[PDB]
Design a protein around this ligand. Structure first.
Ligand SMILES: CCOP(=O)(Cc1ccc(C)cc1)OCC
Ligand SMILES: CCOP(=O)(Cc1ccc(C)cc1)OCC
Ligand SMILES: CCOP(=O)(Cc1ccc(C)cc1)OCC
Ligand SMILES: CCOP(=O)(Cc1ccc(C)cc1)OCC
Ligand SMILES: [Zn+2]
Ligand SMILES: [Zn+2]
Ligand SMILES: [Zn+2]
Ligand SMILES: [Zn+2]
Lengths: 329, 329
């Protein structure tokens, strides 16, 4: 019935056009509060974010899912502020990414489950703001720790009905191992979105997951270091496949009958301390549309390639609504 | 002239008996805020801490230096609250330990220097509380990143006059490489304390460093898992050397004429999330005296072994004052 946002619960119908994998800021736990000047200032950053969100809003975006976990330096107070100023719904996450500190690395599956439930049921920190999704990550073969995270995510999910979204090394088929883990915990594929999937040209890997019930996240659309190879760092991060190629995978899946299984996003951000210094400069150069990239460039592009408008609407309105709706077994 | 505490600046005379390496809590950045229940509750942790500090105060302790860095999950507001409540001065730290997140790992020596200076000159977070010491660490041969940390700690020390205290793997003779880098930076040894030095029986290593003008940190006196060989975990952490063995190193150094270079502490804490679950329990059992261990147990012991009281007062009062006083080259 309802989805938890940083401003409270909204009904399914209020979500509207939703971007399923984004970030206000990409950082580290405690970083933004200890070194705000790294981003110029906290004020500078929030302003940037608001402007960005207002632009996406103007394009039709009504809601975003900020998948920043505790180790991504998620700051729920920053999220609540910009959500209110931009008037954009923001769904917060719980979960763990790949940079956990010792206090986390040393926990058991049982403890991690506990923490995930806390974030979801009780709320984040002392705010009362409840997470609406669980984020997990692997990057090639899962580490023993990661496996734990995966199980914990599954259990928390099984208890709450809240979906799970993942970060993968697409080219390594991480999705496959993740699914194996989730299934072993009894998790239903329809509550899982395997992300960064557009990062591979292997349609057969994607179609096999789709077939099993999983949701496929085509969220690195605008990531391309095309014409920037003069920059190793940018190249390494964004890759060299064009945005059109990535977009085409969306059509490719539609064509195979998996439209109900597709979720699309930008995986964008307004600040990024967890990478090389000044990386944002490069990014804002690569995609000046920011999070408005999807509605502004991708929707028209697919339309133009023959995708029916109704179909696009299902993908950006319907799929997300279903995904996000907390659903128990 | 004055030393920075979490309650403000105090005069050197005001510091009295000082504990140079301690912690209110051993954790991770953001952890305390995110999962306070891991310590029962923030209030519980705070109460435990006040009691513990009141007892040390009762034994003569006027000031403690909490060497918890950003990566240790230092919570200055927490430090401030128990400091006020227990009526004990607390000196806060800047620097980095060995669990830095990606947002730090990726910084340059120049950016790191700036962060350090920030904490010292402007304040920690937004509290206006200024760090009174710089904490760095190695765990055997320094890593590239650790080398950077050491240079930055050096540089910030040079500009502000604040001392540097370190975490070593004494067994490995880390002190030697530490000194090497500091010296390569023009840093006076007299502004450095090589910690956890009681962790080794190598008097050759010790006297060398002392001979050189470095301060020797004998802060693991109470760490011993004797009678706990049953516990792999506590054994690993604590060692199997008795407290007496460690305590005697203090006598040895005095004996060689190095009384003015010794600094003693307990390296105690009231909370510890960065280790196995329930470890505190084990610790409380091993040393019920907590931070009062030194005055209650070590002082009299050394007395009984022949050390002049007057000498013991130099070690606990004079040495620290001198080390802590901001001193420029
Ligand atoms: C915050 C998570 O970052 P990520 O997993 C993915 C990521 C890469 C590039 C851009 C523009 C956004 C997000 O990679 C950082 C090393
Ligand atoms: C944070 C401590 O709360 P708790 O133990 C139980 C708890 C859940 C929900 C609400 C509204 C209050 C308390 O967390 C759930 C795992
Ligand atoms: C927080 C710093 O702890 P440390 O560096 C060393 C340490 C060990 C034991 C005790 C009682 C205190 C401190 O522990 C590594 C996990
Ligand atoms: C905004 C953070 O302050 P700043 O850039 C300069 C600064 C230092 C000290 C005081 C009292 C005010 C301002 O930090 C120094 C490294
Ligand atoms: Zn990701
Ligand atoms: Zn992401
Ligand atoms: Zn240490
Ligand atoms: Zn310590």
């Amino acid at each position: 019935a309802r989805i938890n946002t940083v401003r409270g619960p909204i009904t399914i119908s209020e979500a509207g056009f939703t971007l399923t994998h984004e970030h206000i800021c990409g950082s580290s736990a405690g970083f933004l509060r200890a070194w705000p000047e790294f981003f110029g200032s906290r004020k500078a950053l929030a302003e940037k974010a608001v402007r960005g969100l207002r632009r996406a809003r103007a394009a039709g975006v009504r809601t975003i899912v900020d998948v920043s976990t505790f180790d991504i330096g998620r700051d729920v107070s920053l999220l609540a502020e910009v959500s209110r100023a931009a008037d954009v719904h923001i769904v917060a996450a719980t979960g763990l990414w790949f940079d956990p500190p010792l206090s986390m690395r040393l926990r058991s599956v049982e403890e991690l489950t506990q923490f995930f439930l806390r974030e979801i049921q009780y709320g984040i920190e002392d705010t009362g703001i409840r997470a609406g999704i669980i984020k997990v990550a692997t990057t090639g073969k899962a580490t023993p720790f990661q496996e734990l995270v995966l199980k914990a995510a599954a259990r928390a999910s099984l208890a709450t009905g809240v979906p799970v979204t993942t970060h993968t090394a697409a080219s390594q088929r991480d999705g496959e191992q993740q699914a194996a883990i989730f299934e072993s915990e009894g998790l239903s594929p329809s509550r899982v979105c395997i992300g960064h999937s557009d990062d591979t040209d292997d349609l057969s890997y994607l179609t096999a997951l789709a077939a099993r019930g999983y949701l496929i996240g085509l969220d690195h659309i605008p990531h391309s270091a095309i014409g920037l190879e003069d920059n190793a760092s940018a190249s390494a991060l964004l890759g060299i496949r064009s945005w059109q190629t990535r977009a085409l995978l969306i059509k490719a899946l539609i064509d195979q009958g998996y439209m109900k299984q597709i979720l699309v996003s930008n995986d964008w951000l307004f600040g990024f301390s967890s990478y090389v210094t000044n990386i944002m400069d490069v990014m804002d150069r690569v995609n000046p549309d920011g999070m408005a990239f999807i509605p502004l460039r991708v929707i028209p592009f697919l339309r133009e390639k023959g995708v029916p408008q109704e179909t696009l609407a299902g993908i950006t309105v319907t799929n997300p609504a279903r995904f996000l709706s907390p659903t128990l077994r």
